[PDB]
Write an enzyme that holds these catalytic residues in place. Structure first.
Site, PDB file in Angstrom:
ATOM      1  N   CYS A   1     -46.945 101.942  -7.026  1.00 24.10           N
ATOM      2  CA  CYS A   1     -47.178 102.716  -8.089  1.00 24.10           C
ATOM      3  C   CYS A   1     -47.253 104.129  -7.216  1.00 24.10           C
ATOM      4  CB  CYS A   1     -48.526 102.456  -8.593  1.00 24.10           C
ATOM      5  SG  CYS A   1     -49.231 103.942  -9.556  1.00 24.10           S
TER       6      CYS A   1
ATOM      7  N   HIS B   1     -49.879 107.238   0.050  1.00 19.15           N
ATOM      8  CA  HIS B   1     -49.696 105.855  -0.775  1.00 19.15           C
ATOM      9  C   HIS B   1     -50.671 105.523  -1.462  1.00 19.15           C
ATOM     10  CE1 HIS B   1     -45.101 105.588   0.572  1.00 19.15           C
ATOM     11  NE2 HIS B   1     -45.567 106.253   1.323  1.00 19.15           N
TER      12      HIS B   1
ATOM     13  N   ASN C   1     -51.394 108.003   4.504  1.00 21.74           N
ATOM     14  CA  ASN C   1     -49.947 108.468   4.125  1.00 21.74           C
ATOM     15  C   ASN C   1     -49.485 108.886   2.654  1.00 21.74           C
ATOM     16  OD1 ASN C   1     -49.420 105.749   6.290  1.00 21.74           O
ATOM     17  ND2 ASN C   1     -49.583 107.703   7.143  1.00 21.74           N
TER      18      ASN C   1
END
Lengths: 268, 262
Positions: free
Chosen positions: B221, B186, B184
């Protein structure tokens, strides 16, 4: 995994893991390169080179030598999906007394379709001085019997892409990623930066737009000098075109070349 | 891997790979954490998830990690087979928990255990919330409903303090690369473990083994963010850790680690 019927190659199946895939839910090329390493290592173990060393031979262990990649060339036709099973066959062959190659063929485990091919060239390093040397007769003699004698090539054609000379990128680069540094996970068991980290660093300076619209078909990477744990790398890329790119990794601190390569990308 | 006979836990075996081991030729704790997430994922898939309940998808909700806690007795060697059993449990309105037990395939001896707490997040706003009755009741059918605790005593639930400036040790300017991103886009939760460990002195890593890590997760992050990893000794050797985004100093993780001399 196991040796094949003739004892001169090795095959292993891998189930692609959730964290090994990118945005289209297929294995990344870094995943593929890690699997290439794993099946190569398991090959070496199958023929008697124990896990007391990183696929090193007994003469290597005596002389404090380790293996060093000189070049990697990988061609992927189809990346395996998350949860799919890829079967990889690998073998080693000496090019006379001049070169040491490991080759791989990747297949869909169910259908037998060839989904990728790869090849590599190797040298050795003294683990203490970090000095490179060619594979020695005494080293090669320890595994020659486990290797095909007639030519067996993943890329058999004269002047194939796998053997092409790579030029040096000229400043300025079109694209860059500056200040890449290894973390501990990037190190191998010998505490050297692992060979797949350099592949990742090369790809970091490919624009997002390309990554979003295209799939990597071919990567050719030369390895000139290692990045050490305290070094910092810049990744430089220029378009030379499918889309094709020329790549250079160099140390931030002096501009010393550590890698050069090329990549070929195909629209999705 | 497969579900167990009762359908309420899942087991998988992994052969530890060459690139998964560190200098003692045993699996790193980041390898362990990777195998934990993989067996987690396979479990979720095996009980028909994609992971979100139909109701979660309708309300644009996702699970996010609040905490990971790992305790390792022995790290499996290169080429060894580790068997991991995992299950989930509902923690009523607060969240859910995933637990793991690691065994040596050969001996059946427990070599580690882990527990993770998960909280509900709105995918749009990125704001945390409580678990609704509908989501709870859908989750339960996949879970042992009698408590089954990998950590029954404990350190896994202890509150972690915020490290105070100045830090004893640091690693400044860590940034994710593409390999650190999940499907995804991330950052993978194991990356944060690696970043915490980067500020531990090399002399400690070379001579000691990590016994316990506890890691709270606050905010992520993003791909273009930069992280500072800060460590102070609090003691075996024990450390307090903070990850923060260097552009604003925003905390993204805090944790503790416990190390034993080899």
């Amino acid at each position: 995994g196991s040796l094949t019927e003739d004892g001169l190659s090795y095959k292993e199946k891998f189930v692609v893991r959730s964290y090994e895939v990118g945005s289209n839910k297929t294995a990344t090329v870094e995943t593929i390169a890690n699997l290439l390493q794993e099946v190569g290592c398991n090959h070496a173990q199958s023929v008697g080179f124990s896990t007391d060393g990183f696929a090193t031979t007994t003469t290597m262990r005596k002389l404090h030598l380790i293996w060093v990649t000189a070049r990697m060339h990988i061609e992927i036709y189809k990346y395996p999906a998350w949860g799919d099973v890829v079967e990889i066959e690998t073998w080693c062959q000496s090019e006379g007394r001049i070169g040491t190659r490991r080759d791989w063929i990747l297949k869909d485990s169910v259908t037998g379709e060839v989904t990728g091919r790869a090849t590599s060239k190797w040298v050795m390093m003294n683990q203490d001085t970090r000095r490179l040397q060619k594979v020695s007769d005494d080293v090669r003699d320890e595994y020659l019997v486990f290797c095909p004698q007639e030519p067996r090539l993943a890329f058999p054609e004269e002047n194939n892409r796998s053997l092409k000379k790579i030029p040096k990128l000229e400043d300025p680069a079109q694209y860059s990623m500056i200040g890449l540094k290894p973390r501990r996970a990037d190190l191998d068991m010998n505490q050297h930066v692992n060979n797949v980290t350099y592949i990742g660093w090369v790809l970091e300076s490919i624009p997002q737009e390309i990554v979003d619209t295209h799939e990597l078909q071919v990567i050719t990477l030369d390895y000139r000098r290692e990045c050490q744990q305290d070094d910092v790398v810049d990744s430089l890329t220029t378009t030379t075109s499918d889309s094709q790119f020329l790549h250079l990794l160099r140390l931030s601190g002096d501009g010393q070349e550590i890698n050069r390569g090329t990549t070929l990308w195909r629209k999705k």
